[PDB]
Ligand binder design. Structure first.
Ligand SMILES: C[As](C)(=O)[O-]
Ligand SMILES: C[As](C)(=O)[O-]
Ligand SMILES: [Mg+2]
Ligand SMILES: [Mg+2]
Ligand SMILES: [Zn+2]
Ligand SMILES: [Zn+2]
Ligand SMILES: [Zn+2]
Ligand SMILES: [Zn+2]
Ligand SMILES: [Zn+2]
Ligand SMILES: [Zn+2]
Lengths: 166, 166
């Protein structure tokens, strides 16, 4: 029932901050992390590594502009040009308020902005800015928890350090 | 999957403000309204008008202290004394900050407070104060929408006026 959140972010230090903000916020849609724009487009179009996934758009895309191989703006344009994808809400993760302002000038109907580094308060404020629907839960869905934990571990192994213990 | 929110509130003018804040916030758990503490306890215990309802606790109780017949504090004590009910998060709707402070002194583990009149911003801040889990949705669940619309209509017919049109 709950659709995933697609987090598109290469820089592993930034990924850490964004996932921690997500964990802290208790936002419970399953996170799916891809690390460049080619992988994001594969996820969204169900190709590549994602060829076998269930049909359906993510609830939200958290889209870093800084992506190797295929830039974040190319992902955003292909999303908004697609009749299938164009309805997906997007939070752009930018480097400065000036960058957010420039992106607004492209008129790609970006729904919200977070200026990096991502912190919990600004992050939740961006999600609130989307003006989409939401619901409270007593229990997180177990697949969501498993996914966050799995990424925390992969990211820890890759960065060769951890910040907390569960 | 999503559990309802139980709104316990007699005064019809206050009910209007609380439902509008809920509608505006796009919080999408189904609302269930009861108008005094006797009805609230019947809902929670599946008795009375609610004898046939599905098993399960509401996600949140929005509990007005001012209730005819059975007071809101008696509902809160019976909830916290019950091994079945005591885990339910409660937002108390109070008349002043002094009232919130007094209620905190009872040590009934009240999770959040809204000082009436309820407005959208303070309302969402109270829900955030609960520190519970939540999820975003593109579509509200249709049963939720039907329920809000149904109450708006009953409340309009009872107050003999409306404030907006859908
Ligand atoms: C040494 As330890 C608390 O990271 O298992
Ligand atoms: C007169 As009318 C806009 O309440 O149907
Ligand atoms: Mg980047
Ligand atoms: Mg009252
Ligand atoms: Zn350690
Ligand atoms: Zn680190
Ligand atoms: Zn963690
Ligand atoms: Zn009218
Ligand atoms: Zn009115
Ligand atoms: Zn309405």
């Amino acid at each position: 029932m709950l659709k995933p959140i697609l987090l598109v972010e290469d820089d592993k230090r930034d990924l850490e901050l964004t996932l921690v903000a997500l964990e802290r916020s208790k936002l419970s849609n399953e996170v799916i992390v891809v690390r460049d724009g080619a992988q994001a487009l594969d996820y969204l179009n169900r190709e590549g590594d994602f060829r076998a996934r269930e049909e359906g758009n993510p609830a939200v895309i958290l889209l870093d502009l800084k992506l190797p191989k295929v830039n974040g703006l190319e992902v955003l344009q292909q999303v908004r040009s697609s009749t299938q994808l164009r309805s997906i809400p997007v939070v752009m993760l930018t480097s400065s308020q000036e960058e957010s302002d420039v992106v607004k000038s492209y008129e790609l109907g970006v729904n919200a902005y977070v200026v990096k580094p991502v912190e919990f308060k600004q992050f939740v404020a961006a999600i609130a800015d989307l003006g989409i629907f939401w619901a409270v839960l007593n229990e997180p869905p177990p697949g969501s928890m498993k996914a966050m934990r799995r990424y925390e571990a992969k990211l820890a192994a890759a960065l060769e350090h951890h910040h907390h213990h569960h």
